[PDB]
Design a protein around this ligand. Structure first.
Ligand SMILES: O=C(N[C@@H]1CNCCC[C@H]1OC(=O)c1cc(O)c(C(=O)c2c(O)cccc2C(=O)O)c(O)c1)c1ccc(O)cc1
Length: 339
């Protein structure tokens, strides 16, 4: 615990430095052969890309300046990169290069062949308490890191965790994220995983991450999410209500932990109370976990996804690909002077 501090202490330092003065550009579209599409979103897509001279594959995040600005997400967009190249953490994706053009914003990160966990999760059906424990183990440290730097992630779901080659998850998508002190008020998020602070609209905080951890662990472990309904509106009724019904197969330690994570009252809710992180980290259910060995990836992962070779893409769903257009006359080049 003399241990914990220092680490972060410095941890912070890095961060701010690389947040004050961050790198502009550092590559150009055409040094990469585009291979296939990994995911989509409202204004871009990720793509497997192979480094022209240095075979290294990478995932490349390409955003349509226009579609963006075309709906103030401008702020979000820049944060994403901002943060992304600022942080450093074994469970955080590595941003390899960023650059822009007359049309798009680009982010080329590391390629984690394992794919998403949404898959794995849905493929296997449910995770053994241990398997779950292992993951959770890692989210926790990350948040503990994330919240150190006044960051509140806000976008915790299975689709945002990539199963590295080694069984270790990797968090991606800092879009929704935000760096603040005190409460924030934006309704960012996916029903199934929203603290109730948010819903009721009051001014949430880092807390909201821990609760998501509950629904995550819960989900990772029951095969479904705690609060689930057909229409977002019915889900709000329960989230908010706190009607958590656990499946018999839940250890009791486990069932205990959620009792807390899924604590509708933030002054009661874990990760938030006086001893903070320590409450969770401690709580029995984590007895077996050697935090340090994990943070350093010593542990033998429950599961290691199969990977055929350099560039393998099996673990990712199939998307309809379209070529990358790069207009011949800069677009909204003002609005993205910082990126
Ligand atoms: O994150 C990946 N794929 C992501 C997975 N997460 C959840 C859903 C699938 C997919 O989504 C995207 O590719 C993606 C596409 C987008 O257009 C955007 C955005 O445009 C976007 C944004 O960039 C910032 C804020 C909001 C959005 C948005 O789409 O609403 C995004 O954040 C993710 C991924 C990351 C690294 C890697 O080596 C392999 C894959």
């Amino acid at each position: 615990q003399e241990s914990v501090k220092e680490f972060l202490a410095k941890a912070k330092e890095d961060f701010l430095k690389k947040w004050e003065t961050p790198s502009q550009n550092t590559a150009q579209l055409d040094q990469f052969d585009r291979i296939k599409t990994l995911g989509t979103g409202s204004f871009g897509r990720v793509m497997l890309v192979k480094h022209k001279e240095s075979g290294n594959h990478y995932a490349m995040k390409i955003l349509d300046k226009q579609k963006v600005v075309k709906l103030k997400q401008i702020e979000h967009t820049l944060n994403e990169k901002r943060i992304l190249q600022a942080v450093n953490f074994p469970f955080l994706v590595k941003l390899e290069f960023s650059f822009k053009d007359n049309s798009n914003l680009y982010m080329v990160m590391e390629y984690v062949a394992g794919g998403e966990m949404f898959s794995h999760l849905r493929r296997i059906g449910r995770f053994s308490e241990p398997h779950a424990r292992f993951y959770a183990a890692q989210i926790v440290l990350t948040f503990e890191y994330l919240h150190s730097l006044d960051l509140i992630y806000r976008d915790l779901k299975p689709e945002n965790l990539l199963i590295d080659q080694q069984g270790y998850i990797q968090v991606t998508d800092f879009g929704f994220a935000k760096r603040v002190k005190g409460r924030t008020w934006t309704l960012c998020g996916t029903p199934e995983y929203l603290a109730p602070e948010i819903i009721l609209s009051k001014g949430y905080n880092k807390a909201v991450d821990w609760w998501a951890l509950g629904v995550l662990i819960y989900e990772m472990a029951a095969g479904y999410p705690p609060f689930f309904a057909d229409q977002p509106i019915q889900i709000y009724e329960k989230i908010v209500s706190g009607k958590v019904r656990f499946p018999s197969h839940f250890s009791s330690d486990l069932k205990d932990l959620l009792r807390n994570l899924l604590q509708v009252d933030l002054t009661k809710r874990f990760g938030n109370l006086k001893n903070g992180v320590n409450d969770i980290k401690n709580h029995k259910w984590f007895a077996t976990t050697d935090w340090i060995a994990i943070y350093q990836r010593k542990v033998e992962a429950p599961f290691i996804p199969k990977f055929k070779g350099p560039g393998d893409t099996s673990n990712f769903d199939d998307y309809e690909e379209e070529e990358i257009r790069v207009s011949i006359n800069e677009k909204c080049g003002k609005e993205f002077t910082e990126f």
